[PDB]
């Protein structure tokens, strides 16, 4: 329902390369050209991974601060997490319970459903605070997860701008469990904001360096 | 007069001799990327052997 | 003779002009062998001729 134009964005560095001034073609798992992604707005209902997710919160929005990740969302598999408390970030490979819509004088802590079982943990800094367009790559392949963003300010909230975005790795992640589906995080703080879910399969990339060794141009095989 | 005038932006008349290099070029280069082929061993560089 | 995370090799090291992503190790060629290293533990990159 709604489908949504997702029109260009979603480009991400394969991994090592530093090349430039070059025209080269790489193939990995791609998420296409002028998609359709469901739109959502209050309103979260499950989503599932499906080998690779593009999450895109709009701009103008302050709500999402973290996600649930795993396979059953049960105390059974391995589950995985991540919460920003405005000074950090706080990633749990832990074990968790259910709770169908966890939130954050202004109050928190309600999230939490269950802290046993742990098998992980990781802190960093925090990613950031017409705003900069919050964008993420979520996959694994064999254990290494990876963090991708790029931030840029824009015009027109809801529907995504044109333009270019690579997608740089920030924080690879050699954890190995499942993931088939998942939740994000929200904040009710007395509430309709926007995100995106992409999906990636093996299409053909083809990429262009800059002199500056940066993508800054790229097409696909399928569209035309 | 005109012998310059017609390849002065961009005759279809260069041609033949343009890919000549070109076409070395890309046989030069096709030999270049046999070094990263791999052939059912589990390499293309000799160190990782 | 270099070793680098265990790809021996060799060549003469130098500075790097280039300017490498923070996340990696390796810059490599058409020929499919390495240029351009990340060192294992310095966080200096080096052009490998
Ligand atoms: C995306 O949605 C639009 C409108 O619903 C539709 O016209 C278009 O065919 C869809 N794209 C694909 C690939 O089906
Ligand atoms: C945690 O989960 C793992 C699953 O591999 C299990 O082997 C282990 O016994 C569990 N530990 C506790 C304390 O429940
Ligand atoms: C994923 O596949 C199944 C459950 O989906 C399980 O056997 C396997 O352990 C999982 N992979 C991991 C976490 O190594
Ligand atoms: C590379 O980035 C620098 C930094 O802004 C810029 O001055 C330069 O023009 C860029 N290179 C090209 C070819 O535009
Ligand atoms: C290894 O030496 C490097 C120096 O660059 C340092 O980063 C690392 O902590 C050292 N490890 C030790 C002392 O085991």
Known sequence: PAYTNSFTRGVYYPDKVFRSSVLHSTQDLFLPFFSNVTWFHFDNPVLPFNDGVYFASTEKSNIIRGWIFGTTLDSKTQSLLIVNNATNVVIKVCEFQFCNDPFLMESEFRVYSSANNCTFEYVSQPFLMFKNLREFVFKNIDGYFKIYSKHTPINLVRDLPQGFSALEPLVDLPIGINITRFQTLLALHRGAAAYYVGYLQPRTFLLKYNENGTITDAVDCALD | ?49 | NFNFNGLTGTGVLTESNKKFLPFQQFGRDIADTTDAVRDPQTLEILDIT
């Open chain 2, 1 to 49: 007069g005109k012998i310059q005038d017609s390849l002065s932006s961009t005759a279809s008349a260069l041609g033949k001799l343009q890919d000549v290099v070109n076409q070395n070029a890309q046989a030069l280069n096709t030999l270049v990327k046999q070094l990263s082929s791999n052939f059912g061993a589990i390499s293309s560089v000799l160190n990782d052997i």
